Short mmCIF file of C-alpha atoms and ligand atoms in Angstrom, two decimals:
data_model
loop_
_atom_site.label_atom_id
_atom_site.label_comp_id
_atom_site.label_asym_id
_atom_site.label_seq_id
_atom_site.Cartn_x
_atom_site.Cartn_y
_atom_site.Cartn_z
CA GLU A 1 60.16 223.46 -192.69
CA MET A 2 59.51 227.22 -192.45
CA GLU A 3 61.79 230.29 -192.47
CA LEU A 4 60.42 233.59 -191.11
CA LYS A 5 56.74 234.29 -191.81
CA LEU A 6 54.89 237.60 -191.22
CA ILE A 7 52.22 237.29 -188.65
CA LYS A 8 53.71 240.79 -187.82
CA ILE A 9 54.84 239.36 -184.48
CA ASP A 10 55.55 241.92 -181.78
CA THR A 11 59.23 241.13 -180.87
CA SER A 12 59.58 243.71 -178.02
CA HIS A 13 58.77 240.98 -175.49
CA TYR A 14 57.61 237.35 -175.42
CA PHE A 15 56.16 234.72 -173.08
CA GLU A 16 57.91 231.55 -171.94
CA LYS A 17 56.13 228.45 -170.77
CA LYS A 18 57.14 227.31 -167.29
CA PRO A 19 56.61 223.91 -165.57
CA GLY A 20 53.58 223.47 -163.25
CA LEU A 21 50.89 224.37 -161.92
CA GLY A 22 50.75 227.93 -163.20
CA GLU A 23 50.02 231.05 -161.20
CA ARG A 24 46.43 231.56 -160.10
CA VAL A 25 44.66 234.49 -161.83
CA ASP A 26 41.06 235.43 -160.96
CA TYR A 27 39.29 237.09 -163.89
CA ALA A 28 35.53 237.90 -164.31
CA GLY A 29 34.55 235.55 -161.40
CA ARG A 30 36.45 232.59 -162.82
CA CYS A 31 39.81 230.98 -162.08
CA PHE A 32 42.79 230.73 -164.37
CA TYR A 33 46.15 229.09 -163.99
CA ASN A 34 48.79 230.92 -165.92
CA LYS A 35 51.58 228.58 -167.10
CA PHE A 36 53.37 231.32 -169.15
CA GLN A 37 55.82 233.90 -167.84
CA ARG A 38 56.16 237.25 -169.54
CA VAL A 39 59.77 238.00 -170.48
CA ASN A 40 60.57 241.67 -170.87
CA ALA A 41 63.33 241.19 -173.45
CA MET A 42 63.38 240.95 -177.21
CA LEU A 43 62.16 237.91 -179.09
CA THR A 44 65.37 237.26 -181.03
CA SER A 45 66.18 235.02 -184.00
CA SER A 46 68.20 232.88 -181.56
CA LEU A 47 65.11 232.35 -179.34
CA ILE A 48 62.81 231.37 -182.24
CA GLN A 49 65.28 228.69 -183.44
CA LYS A 50 65.36 227.37 -179.90
CA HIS A 51 61.58 227.24 -179.98
CA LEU A 52 61.63 225.38 -183.33
CA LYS A 53 64.12 222.93 -181.82
CA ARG A 54 61.72 222.41 -178.88
CA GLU A 55 64.40 223.45 -176.36
CA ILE A 56 62.03 226.21 -175.19
CA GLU A 57 58.31 227.03 -175.58
CA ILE A 58 57.69 230.69 -176.44
CA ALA A 59 54.49 232.63 -177.27
CA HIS A 60 54.04 236.03 -178.90
CA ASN A 61 51.52 238.67 -177.75
CA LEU A 62 48.52 238.98 -180.02
CA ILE A 63 47.59 242.32 -178.46
CA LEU A 64 49.71 245.21 -179.71
CA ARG A 65 50.31 248.57 -178.03
CA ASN A 66 47.21 250.79 -178.19
CA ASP A 67 45.05 247.59 -177.99
CA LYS A 68 45.20 246.75 -181.71
CA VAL A 69 45.56 243.27 -183.20
CA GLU A 70 47.11 242.53 -186.65
CA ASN A 71 45.45 239.05 -186.89
CA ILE A 72 42.37 237.25 -185.62
CA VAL A 73 43.02 233.58 -185.05
CA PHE A 74 41.31 230.23 -184.86
CA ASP A 75 43.01 227.84 -182.44
CA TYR A 76 41.88 224.43 -183.68
CA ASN A 77 42.22 221.64 -181.11
CA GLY A 78 40.62 218.68 -182.94
CA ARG A 79 41.94 215.76 -184.92
CA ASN A 80 40.60 216.67 -188.35
CA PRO A 81 42.57 219.78 -189.43
CA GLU A 82 41.86 219.23 -193.15
CA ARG A 83 38.09 219.20 -192.55
CA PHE A 84 38.36 222.18 -190.22
CA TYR A 85 40.52 224.12 -192.69
CA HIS A 86 38.25 223.42 -195.65
CA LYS A 87 35.10 224.74 -193.91
CA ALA A 88 36.98 227.69 -192.38
CA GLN A 89 38.46 228.81 -195.73
CA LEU A 90 34.95 228.69 -197.41
CA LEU A 91 33.59 230.83 -194.56
CA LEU A 92 36.48 233.34 -194.63
CA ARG A 93 36.59 234.09 -198.40
CA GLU A 94 32.84 234.54 -198.31
CA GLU A 95 32.93 236.99 -195.40
CA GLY A 96 35.54 238.94 -197.40
CA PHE A 97 38.83 237.52 -196.00
CA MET A 98 41.06 236.21 -198.74
CA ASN A 99 44.41 236.31 -196.87
CA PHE A 100 45.05 233.67 -194.24
CA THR A 101 47.67 231.16 -193.09
CA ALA A 102 47.23 227.92 -191.11
CA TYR A 103 50.19 226.66 -189.08
CA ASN A 104 50.91 223.45 -187.29
CA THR A 105 51.12 223.76 -183.52
CA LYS A 106 52.64 221.39 -180.91
CA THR A 107 49.93 218.63 -180.91
CA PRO A 108 49.57 216.74 -184.27
CA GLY A 109 46.19 217.63 -185.78
CA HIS A 110 46.10 221.05 -184.07
CA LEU A 111 46.48 224.35 -185.93
CA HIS A 112 46.54 228.07 -185.59
CA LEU A 113 44.72 229.72 -188.47
CA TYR A 114 45.77 233.39 -188.68
CA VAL A 115 43.39 235.66 -190.66
CA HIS A 116 45.59 238.51 -191.92
CA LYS A 117 43.21 241.44 -191.40
CA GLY A 118 45.49 244.34 -190.54
CA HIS A 119 45.41 246.57 -187.46
CA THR A 120 41.98 246.28 -185.88
CA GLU A 121 40.71 247.73 -182.58
CA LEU A 122 40.85 244.93 -179.93
CA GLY A 123 37.08 244.90 -179.07
CA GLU A 124 36.08 244.84 -182.76
CA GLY A 125 38.48 242.03 -183.45
CA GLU A 126 37.10 240.08 -180.44
CA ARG A 127 33.60 240.55 -181.73
CA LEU A 128 34.34 239.79 -185.42
CA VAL A 129 36.22 236.56 -184.61
CA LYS A 130 33.42 235.46 -182.21
CA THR A 131 30.83 236.06 -184.92
CA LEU A 132 32.83 233.99 -187.43
CA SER A 133 33.27 231.26 -184.80
CA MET A 134 29.45 231.13 -184.33
CA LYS A 135 28.92 230.94 -188.10
CA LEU A 136 31.51 228.16 -188.34
CA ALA A 137 29.94 226.17 -185.43
CA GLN A 138 26.73 225.82 -187.48
CA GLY A 139 28.54 223.59 -190.00
CA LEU A 140 31.20 221.91 -187.78
CA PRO A 141 31.28 220.70 -184.13
CA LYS A 142 33.25 223.33 -182.13
CA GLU A 143 36.76 222.08 -181.38
CA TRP A 144 38.53 225.42 -181.58
CA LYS A 145 39.00 228.55 -179.50
CA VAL A 146 39.18 232.01 -181.04
CA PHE A 147 41.69 234.85 -180.45
CA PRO A 148 41.59 237.59 -179.33
CA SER A 149 38.93 237.03 -176.70
CA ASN A 150 37.79 238.64 -173.48
CA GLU A 151 36.81 235.20 -172.15
CA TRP A 152 40.25 234.87 -170.44
CA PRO A 153 42.79 237.40 -169.01
CA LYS A 154 44.52 239.74 -171.45
CA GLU A 155 47.83 237.95 -171.04
CA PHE A 156 46.24 234.63 -172.20
CA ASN A 157 45.79 236.31 -175.60
CA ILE A 158 49.19 234.95 -176.64
CA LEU A 159 50.14 232.22 -179.17
CA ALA A 160 52.93 229.67 -179.10
CA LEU A 161 55.10 230.30 -182.13
CA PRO A 162 54.08 228.22 -185.12
CA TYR A 163 56.14 225.20 -186.18
CA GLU A 164 55.24 224.54 -189.87
CA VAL A 165 52.89 226.07 -192.47
CA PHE A 166 49.87 223.77 -192.99
CA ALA A 167 48.14 225.79 -195.72
CA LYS A 168 47.92 229.27 -197.09
CA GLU A 169 45.56 231.25 -199.28
CA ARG A 170 46.02 234.71 -200.75
CA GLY A 171 43.90 236.81 -203.07
CA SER A 172 42.27 240.04 -204.14
CA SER A 173 38.81 241.02 -205.28
CA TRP A 174 37.41 244.07 -207.06
CA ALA A 175 33.75 244.80 -207.87
CA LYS A 176 31.77 247.79 -209.25
N1 LIG B 201 49.25 233.16 -170.65
C1 LIG B 201 48.86 231.92 -170.96
N2 LIG B 201 48.57 231.58 -172.27
C2 LIG B 201 48.19 230.30 -172.54
C3 LIG B 201 48.14 229.28 -171.45
N3 LIG B 201 47.72 228.12 -171.99
C4 LIG B 201 47.60 228.32 -173.34
N4 LIG B 201 47.88 229.64 -173.65
C5 LIG B 201 47.87 230.28 -174.98
C6 LIG B 201 49.18 230.00 -175.73
C7 LIG B 201 48.76 228.89 -176.68
O1 LIG B 201 49.53 228.88 -177.89
C8 LIG B 201 47.28 229.24 -176.95
C9 LIG B 201 46.33 228.11 -177.35
O2 LIG B 201 46.33 227.13 -176.29
P1 LIG B 201 46.37 225.53 -176.62
O3 LIG B 201 46.39 224.87 -175.28
O4 LIG B 201 45.50 225.09 -177.83
O5 LIG B 201 47.95 225.42 -177.03
P2 LIG B 201 48.66 225.35 -178.44
O6 LIG B 201 47.72 225.78 -179.58
O7 LIG B 201 49.84 226.23 -178.42
O8 LIG B 201 49.17 223.85 -178.74
P3 LIG B 201 48.33 222.55 -179.24
O9 LIG B 201 46.88 222.86 -179.45
O10 LIG B 201 48.44 221.67 -178.04
O11 LIG B 201 48.94 222.22 -180.52
O12 LIG B 201 46.80 229.71 -175.72
C10 LIG B 201 48.46 229.74 -170.09
O13 LIG B 201 48.36 228.91 -169.10
N5 LIG B 201 48.80 231.03 -169.96
#
């Protein structure tokens, strides 16, 4: 199971997955089909339970007002989450990140790994997560996407609510 965990989800609005298809979006010379509809109403406790029951499929917006993000995220889409998570956690602690949480997503094997950085300017967070992704791809075949990213439209920087906690690490360091 899992109760309520602090990704510091923005609850002012949410995104609902719709059947289809998806609405065409052109972005940076490329085509996207958007299968999620923004809902301009609060993400309530009621709605999350419905999501956990799989009666609905809701996503929260990674990008906060003033283009800040609270988390950078690895979206792992492979079938070896334990191997992925092991190499990711070694990389993270080493690059200074000791606070992160991996959650199970809808497809067995898949995860979202949130790195609990704190409010970060959007561009900087895009860059930092890309750089980590590159470092990680040296030691593992790339079967993840990273968030936030400018590779897709701003509204595709959303994450389906997590279903279960896969793993979690916490810590603090002090030198000199
Ligand atoms: N706005 C928008 N966001 C999307 C769309 N497709 C995916 N996303 C966002 C929400 C998803 O949680 C996130 C990662 O996409 P994935 O296809 O890996 O889905 P997800 O991780 O939720 O499930 P899974 O890997 O299948 O366990 O990307 C879309 O068509 N429109």
